[PDB]
């Protein structure tokens, strides 16, 4: 931070004993950090030397007794609620809260490491390694030593809380059916079937801010006005169900105008001897045809989902980059880590910044040739 | 197509089929490592298992497969790599292996399921490899996940 250099010497352990190495076996010297050529626009990096990328690397290592290369690298990091840990872009976890610190509101945060391995620097002024200039404003910098590398990040106070749940999907058509003492919800828009107990969840006593309630009522009215205003009737107030797998389903039961008439005329015959919510399942002769009609619709959607999911799941094993890109709606790198997929954002490059080499031949070995063209 | 698990094999231009036999999840045990002691350059590609058809029956050695299948061979082998990480499906969840060693078992609800065919609001990072040092010195091969068609 003070100058942009490293000591050209390092402590290492071999034979269960500490020993000090020296770059090219010389004396302690402040070596200059220079940018890496492969450094991306965002994930920047710096080194004291480049010996790894050049050919004859083995001979370069054997040309000296000891070699030491100081690395500095800027990476993305993510932490999710409760924020007890964070993960680096390298795939490595750090078992400390990114909000941890000696400040009054932070020493209560989670940490797995001893105080010896953590230091918080106040009044810290950054120095960009590409443009040797101090930052205009001070910050508090957290510093942590893992057994592999040291890691640093700017400390910030914990953000204010947000609503416990987010709207995942709006669904125009969702069939609910009672079976085996549980509800089962299904749709053509989502291939999963949600299972739930018959009891409605008492959301009103937990969503004290009406954050989920407001979003549900508004979305249902938007959809109803758009697609059902002239074809169906809403039976009653929205109902909330906690589905297996950890989802909250807000549901609004509907009746088609043509079906509502059967309840109306049946009610008139009963009165001669309106609240649809009281009548919905009381007339077996009206419901029996409906269970068979809608049951066939639900089964048809299941068959389509199994057919489509099978093709889609096989395609991603052949080319995950293409399948992930169309699923996410932007170019992403993807890789199958066994039976799950890892993903990352690809970085764009303007077409005029790319140059193509005139030949795919290899001079070093006459029998081989590149199978895809070289570029710069 | 049949609506039940079946084994199938292409005998040229027609398909031979047979019924797979089910095994309860508690009768299956996963081994702690994928290393092969007999030959240091190789490692199993899919984890080893040991199980029983019936709770009181004799124990049977095998190897895991795709979608909860159990193979009786122990023959899927790779040259051993560095930086290896894998999640294998294991009875309504996953087993996580790191550097050819068993680590822990996740519930299927622990991973974010991508929406059916189109999804948004997904968070991601500009993944930076941080390759192990041995890839330069000993020139050992870096793990690259399962093979794409390309």
């Amino acid at each position, epitope marked *: 931070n003070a100058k942009g250099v490293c000591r050209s010497t390092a402590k290492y352990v071999r034979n269960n004993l500490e020993t000090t190495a020296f770059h090219r076996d010389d004396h302690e010297t402040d070596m200059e950090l220079k940018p890496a050529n492969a450094a991306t626009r965002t994930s920047r990096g710096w080194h004291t030397t480049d010996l790894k990328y050049n050919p004859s690397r083995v001979e370069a290592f054997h040309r000296y007794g000891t070699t030491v290369n100081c690395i500095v690298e800027e990476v993305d990091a993510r932490s999710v609620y409760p924020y007890d*840990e964070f993960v680096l872009a390298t795939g490595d976890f750090v*078992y400390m809260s990114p909000f941890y610190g000696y400040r009054e509101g932070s020493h209560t945060e989670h940490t*797995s490491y*001893a105080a010896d391995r953590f230091k918080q620097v106040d009044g810290f002024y950054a120095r960009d390694l590409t443009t040797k200039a101090r930052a205009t404003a001070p910050t508090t910098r957290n510093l942590l030593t*893992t057994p592999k590398f040291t890691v640093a990040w700017d400390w910030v106070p914990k953000r204010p809380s947000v609503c416990t749940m987010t709207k995942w999907q709006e669904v125009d058509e969702m069939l609910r059916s009672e079976y085996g003492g549980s509800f089962r919800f299904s749709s053509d828009a989502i291939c999963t079937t949600f299972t739930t107990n018959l009891t409605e969840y008492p959301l009103s006593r937990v969503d004290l801010g009406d954050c989920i309630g407001k979003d549900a009522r508004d979305a249902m009215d938007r959809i109803f006005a758009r697609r059902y205003n002239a074809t169906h009737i809403k039976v009653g107030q929205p109902q909330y169900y906690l589905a297996n797998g950890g989802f909250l389903i807000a549901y609004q039961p509907l009746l088609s105008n043509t079906l509502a008439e059967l309840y109306v005329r049946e009610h008139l015959r009963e009165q001669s001897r309106i609240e649809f919510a009281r009548l919905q399942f009381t007339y077996n002769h009206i419901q029996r045809p409906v269970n068979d009609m809608l049951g066939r619709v639900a089964i048809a959607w299941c068959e389509l989902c199994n057919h489509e999911l099978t093709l889609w799941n096989e395609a991603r094993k052949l080319n995950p980059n293409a399948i992930a890109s169309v699923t996410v709606g932007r170019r992403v790198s993807a890789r199958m880590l066994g039976d799950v997929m890892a993903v990352s954002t690809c970085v764009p490059v303007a077409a005029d910044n790319v140059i193509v080499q005139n030949s795919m031949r290899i001079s070093s070995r006459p029998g081989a040739c590149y199978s895809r063209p070289l570029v710069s | 197509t049949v609506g039940r698990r079946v084994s199938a094999r292409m005998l040229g231009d027609v398909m031979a089929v047979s019924t797979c036999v089910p095994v309860a999840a508690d009768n299956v045990i996963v081994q702690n490592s994928m290393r092969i002691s007999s030959r240091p350059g190789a490692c199993y590609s899919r984890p080893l298992v040991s199980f029983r058809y019936e709770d009181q029956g004799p124990l049977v050695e095998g190897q895991l497969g795709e979608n909860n299948e159990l193979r009786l061979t122990r023959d899927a082998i790779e040259p051993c790599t560095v930086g290896h990480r894998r999640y294998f499906t294991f009875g309504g969840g996953y087993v*996580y292996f790191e550097e050819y*060693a068993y*680590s*822990h078992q996740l*519930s299927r609800a622990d991973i974010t399921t991508v929406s059916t065919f189109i999804d948004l609001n997904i968070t991601m990072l500009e993944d930076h490899e941080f390759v192990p040092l041995e890839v330069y010195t000993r020139h050992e091969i870096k793990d690259s996940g399962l093979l794409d068609y390309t």
Partner: nanobody
Amino acid sequence: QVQLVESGGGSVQPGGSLRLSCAASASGRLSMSGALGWYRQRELVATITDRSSTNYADSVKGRFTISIDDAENTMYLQMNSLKPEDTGVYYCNARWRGMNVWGKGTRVTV
């Protein structure tokens, strides 16, 4: 789901010693955990923050020693020369790459 079977808690006299332990179900291998350890009431007491790296609170250095057995899939916290200030509830915890688990806390008296 992983489950921790905590044991060894109790009561002693000043200058005494104890041995706490937490055995884990086969669904979580302790020797592969990112972090493991005990927390007083929360505040850290002793942990293993990497498969071969150990940590302790300043008042605990030299008194307690944490260890692990991969065969029995259990960790131990040997604690010696105990003082009245060491009394309280101790909670064992283990975590694997985002998955986290807490044991039911056990009391220790002096």
